[PDB]
Amino acid sequence: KHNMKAFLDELKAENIKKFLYNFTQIPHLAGTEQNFQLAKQIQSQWKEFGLDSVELAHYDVLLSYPNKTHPNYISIINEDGNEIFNTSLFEPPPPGYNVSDIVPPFSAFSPQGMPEGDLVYVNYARTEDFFKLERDMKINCSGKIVIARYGKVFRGNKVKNAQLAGAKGVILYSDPADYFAPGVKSYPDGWNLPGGGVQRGNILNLNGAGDPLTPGYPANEYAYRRGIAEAVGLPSIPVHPIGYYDAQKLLEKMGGSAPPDSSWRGSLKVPYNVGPGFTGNFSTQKVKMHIHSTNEVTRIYNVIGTLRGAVEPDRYVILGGHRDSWVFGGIDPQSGAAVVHEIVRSFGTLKKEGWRPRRTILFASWDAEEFGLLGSTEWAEENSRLLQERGVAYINADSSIEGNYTLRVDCTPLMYSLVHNLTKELKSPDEGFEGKSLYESWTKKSPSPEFSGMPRISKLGSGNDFEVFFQRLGIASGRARYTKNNKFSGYPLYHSVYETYELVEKFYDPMFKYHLTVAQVRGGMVFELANSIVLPFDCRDYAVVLRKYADKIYSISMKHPQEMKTYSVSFDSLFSAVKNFTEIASKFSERLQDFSNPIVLRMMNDQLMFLERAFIDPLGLPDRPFYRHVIYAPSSHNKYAGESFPGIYDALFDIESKVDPSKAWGEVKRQIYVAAFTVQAAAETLSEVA
């Protein structure tokens, strides 16, 4: 028979291994000829595998690259103007890699400049770190160069924070506290970051816009582009990343104030003085950045494969992940792309035997994810009306592994039940759990903070290609990978030259069993979403979390009882809406369990499909028009993390500091009204239709 077990059994670890090797021999930087050739290869193979149609969708978007003949670096410069120390021009390449087109470490979209000044050390450059510096320690960052350790929050938030503090430049570095696990060797002898390793990465704050020059519309051949002065999300100060050998040289001379406490100290043999500037003898030395990167409109290519549905071809289940990498992409993204490739091969095997899924499955190899989700977002802008009206679900497929300990899942509440049920039917690949389910191992290793006997599933934020589908368009989305036991900092070799096939094969997953388990989870989700007669979404799970999120935001507000009294700030409407949602969802579930009638079925499937869609506000969130989901948005302090009831959360954040409390609390009340209304409107989509 042709059922999920047949699909799952066709998946093979050995194929994933072969694909990963094939995908990681040369760099595949977005916008480069190498990445276009790989796109063409994938297109050809997906056709061979049996998909109905496989096309390239291209766009011309703003990318950023270093200047090959004018390299980026940082100096310590003496009073005479002599540069007495320089940071590296490249990472030492790994053994066996005379590869020529390795992009040197840089911060994509940094402006050009040669700022020269005194250093201030700002820990992780988080909102609370700048509060500590400016409010408690009374240190002024205006006209200073900020040095910050990577970790904890998206680097673009660090840069925005530094900019608003008045910094004239930002130096990002990898501290061994965050990127060197105790007792493991550095690459190539282990999976740790060497002192010469550096984390690449973009520093934009796009808030969901996609290509900086074309917000709202696809960057096609006739697109009108913003002038660079009006581009979305570009930083105004230069930024550059370095490794910890170089950072130690910059930090060791730091003077001024002591770190305020131990949470500001990393593992290097330096004081972690905050500054500003260097200790007495070196007080006249400065730090000088030299950044010469350019922003360039460049063609990118998505591969889009279609497997037409037998019964509901106008309903789309999408499996997507990116293909562009910073260098070799051993983990990010090719460990994910190899899994997608084997999933396509498996579905195609069933297709060649006469099977088709109930609903259409779309498969995507996205481009320019590393530059801000540009490929997925431009394609979703081009196809927004089709996706709006036909999109059932989106499953992401970036890195399959970032460790080998247990499963990690973020998804809409609508998919919790699907994930629980699927993982109870899959074998655990873990040592000590042979013969046990993946649900059993995952629940043991990553227990739910609220329920006994359940695993942890987190809120979707951003940082990957599901963002446009979920936060802009309101299509139910999910993601899953194998992880470690600093969940937002990345694994040690993240975005470094050292992320290679050998890293994965030697140190992460020699038997490709964790990859295979991830293929079964991602592929199994897609199979059920595309094949189940009734869509596998449980609306009651949204009702449960909505109460949790309402309790949480009420509790934040209740830190200010006098203001809530003064401005008559009531959450009664929001709790009422949540109560109604709970009641209506329970009744809908009863009807769904209780109906041969394909119109009632589809009517009910449409109610399930449009339920995520109902949380979209067409006016967007304040000053973030492309984040339209009222329940979830990426955190304003950390793009990687999701925030619940974000419009109310941001209205309450640091509210005690606002100089017009009447206005500030007014806006809290406005956000409570928008949230209560949206929850009740979403509930009403589940009521009997007439």
Ligand X SMILES: O=C(N[C@@H](CCCCNC(=O)c1ccc(I)cc1)C(=O)O)N[C@@H](Cc1ccncc1)C(=O)O
Ligand Y SMILES: *[C@@H]1O[C@H](CO)[C@@H](O[C@@H]2O[C@H](CO)[C@@H](O)[C@H](O)[C@H]2NC(C)=O)[C@H](O)[C@H]1NC(C)=O
Ligand Z SMILES: *[C@@H]1O[C@H](CO)[C@@H](O[C@@H]2O[C@H](CO)[C@@H](O[C@@H]3O[C@H](CO)[C@@H](O)[C@H](O[C@H]4O[C@H](CO)[C@@H](O)[C@H](O)[C@@H]4O)[C@@H]3O)[C@H](O)[C@H]2NC(C)=O)[C@H](O)[C@H]1NC(C)=O
End-to-end CA distance of the chain: 40
Instruction: Check if 570 is active-site.
Output: yes
Question: Which residues contribute to the annotated binding site for Zn(2+)?
Answer: 322, 332, 370, 398, 495
Give me 209's structure tokens: 């816009």
**262-270 long-range Cβ contacts below 8 angstroms, 24+ apart:** 263/123, 264/121, 264/123, 264/129, 265/177, 266/149, 266/175, 266/176, 266/177, 266/178, 267/175, 267/176, 267/177, 267/180, 268/175, 268/176, 268/244
Question: Which residues contribute to the annotated binding site?
Answer: 155, 202, 214, 217, 322, 332, 369-370, 378, 381, 398, 462-464, 479-481, 494-495, 639-640
Of ligand Y, ligand Z, ligand NAG, none, which one sits near residue 67, judging by CB under 5 to 8 A according to partner kind? Answer: ligand NAG
Complex with ligand NAG: residue 469 or 507, whichever CB lies closer: 507
Please state the φ and ψ torsions of residue 26, each to the nearest 5 degrees: -135, 160
Complex with a copy of itself: residue 93 or 216, whichever CB lies closer: 216
Q: Work out whether 568 is an interface residue with a copy of itself (CB under 8 A).
A: no
State which of residues 175, 324, 332, 502 lies at the interface with Zn ion (CB under 5 A): 332
What's the one-letter identity of residue 12?
K
Q: Work out whether 396 is an interface residue with Cl ion (CB under 5 A).
A: yes
Query: Binding string, 411-450, against a copy of itself, x = CB under 8 A?
Result: ----------------------------------------
Active-site hit among 369, 430, 538, 643: 369
Nearest residue to 94 (alpha-carbon basis) of 166, 196, 2, 185:
196
Shortest distance (Å) from residue 660 CB to ligand X:
33
Active-site hit among 629, 636, 643, 650: 629
> Which of the residues 638 through 677 are near ligand X (CB under 6 A)?
639-640
Q: Work out whether 505 is an interface residue with a copy of itself (CB under 8 A).
A: no
Shortest distance (Å) from residue 685 CB to a copy of itself:
5
Question: CA 217, CA 385: separation in Å to the nearest integer?
Answer: 12
Choose one: 217-225, 239-247, 465-473, 672-680; the region binding Ca ion (CB under 5 A). Answer: 217-225
Shortest distance (Å) from residue 378 CB to Ca ion:
5
Other Cβ atoms within 10 Å of 679 Cβ, number? 29
Contact assessment for residue 669 and residue 567, using Cβ atoms and an 8 Å cutoff: yes
Instruction: Check if 44 is active-site.
Output: no
By residue count, the chain amounts to 690
**Spacing of C-alpha 317 from chain mean position:** 20
Q: Work out whether 214 is an interface residue with Ca ion (CB under 5 A).
A: yes
Q: Is 106 helix (H, G, I), strand (E, B) or coil?
A: coil
**DSSP code at position 230:** G
State which of residues 1, 81, 136, 142 lies at the interface with ligand NAG (CB under 6 A): 142
Q: Work out whether 522 is an interface residue with ligand X (CB under 6 A).
A: no
Of ligand NAG, Zn ion, ligand Y, none, which one sits near residue 162, judging by CB under 5 to 8 A according to partner kind? Answer: none
Per-position b or e across 505-535, b if 16+ CB within 10 A of its CB? bebbbeebbbbbbbbbbbbbbbbbbbbeeeb
Q: Work out whether 398 is an interface residue with Zn ion (CB under 5 A).
A: yes
Q: Output the CA torsion 402→407→408→413 (10° steps).
A: 160
Q: Work out whether 398 is an interface residue with Cl ion (CB under 5 A).
A: yes
Query: Burial of 2 by CB count in 10 Å (0-12 exposed, 13-18 middle, 19+ buried)?
Result: middle
153 DSSP β-pair partners: 151
What's the one-letter identity of residue 348?
G
205: alpha, beta or left, given left = phi > 0 and alpha = psi -120 to 50?
beta
Shortest distance (Å) from residue 63 CB to ligand Z:
15
Instruction: Check if 346 is active-site.
Output: no
Instruction: Check if 236 is active-site.
Output: no
Complex with Cl ion: residue 509 or 650, whichever CB lies closer: 509
State which of residues 606, 622, 653, 658 lies at the interface with a copy of itself (CB under 8 A): 606
> Which of the residues 17 through 76 are near a copy of itself (CB under 8 A)?
52
Complex with Cl ion: residue 378 or 410, whichever CB lies closer: 410
Of a copy of itself, Ca ion, ligand Z, none, which one sits near residue 580, judging by CB under 5 to 8 A according to partner kind? Answer: ligand Z
Complex with Zn ion: residue 203 or 550, whichever CB lies closer: 203
Question: CA 48, CA 631: separation in Å to the nearest integer?
Answer: 42
Of ligand Y, Ca ion, Cl ion, none, which one sits near residue 196, judging by CB under 5 to 8 A according to partner kind? Answer: none
Contact assessment for residue 162 and residue 141, using Cβ atoms and an 8 Å cutoff: yes
Of ligand Y, ligand X, Zn ion, none, which one sits near residue 417, judging by CB under 5 to 8 A according to partner kind? Answer: ligand Y
Q: Work out whether 46 is an interface residue with ligand X (CB under 6 A).
A: no
Active-site hit among 570, 573, 589, 617: 570
Shortest distance (Å) from residue 329 CB to ligand NAG:
17
Complex with ligand X: residue 168 or 459, whichever CB lies closer: 459
Contact assessment for residue 187 and residue 94, using Cβ atoms and an 8 Å cutoff: yes
Q: Work out whether 57 is an interface residue with ligand Z (CB under 6 A).
A: no
Give me 256's structure tokens: 């001024």
Give me 352's structure tokens: 């060649």
The residue to which tokens 């096609």 are assigned: 220
Q: Work out whether 183 is an interface residue with ligand NAG (CB under 6 A).
A: no
Nearest residue to 656 (alpha-carbon basis) of 544, 552, 560, 520:
560
Helix (H) or strand (E) holding 250: helix 244-251
Shortest distance (Å) from residue 332 CB to Zn ion:
4
Q: Work out whether 586 is an interface residue with ligand Y (CB under 6 A).
A: no
State which of residues 202, 477, 582, 607 lies at the interface with ligand X (CB under 6 A): 202
> Which of the residues 469 through 508 are near Cl ion (CB under 5 A)?
479
Contact assessment for residue 528 and residue 353, using Cβ atoms and an 8 Å cutoff: no
Of ligand X, Zn ion, Ca ion, none, which one sits near residue 211, judging by CB under 5 to 8 A according to partner kind? Answer: Ca ion
Q: Work out whether 75 is an interface residue with ligand X (CB under 6 A).
A: no
What's the one-letter identity of residue 321?
G
Rg (CA), the chain: 25
Of ligand Y, Zn ion, a copy of itself, none, which one sits near residue 349, judging by CB under 5 to 8 A according to partner kind? Answer: none
State which of residues 577, 604, 668, 675 lies at the interface with ligand Z (CB under 6 A): 577
Residues 6+ apart with CB under 8 A from 310: 356, 357, 358
The residue to which tokens 């009420």 are assigned: 554
Alpha helices in 510-597 (DSSP H): 513-531, 539-557, 561-566, 572-593
Residues 6+ apart with CB under 8 A from 428: 434, 436, 437, 438, 440, 441, 442, 517
Residues recognised as catalytic? 369, 570, 606, 629
What are the residues binding Zn ion (CB under 5 A)? 332-333, 398
What are the residues binding ligand Y (CB under 6 A)? 22, 25, 41, 44-45, 75, 83-86, 417-418, 421, 536, 538, 593
What are the residues binding ligand Z (CB under 6 A)? 221, 573, 576-577, 580, 676, 680
What are the residues binding Cl ion (CB under 5 A)? 396, 398, 479
What are the residues binding ligand X (CB under 6 A)? 154, 201-202, 332, 369-370, 372-373, 398-399, 408-410, 462-464, 479-481, 488, 490, 639-640
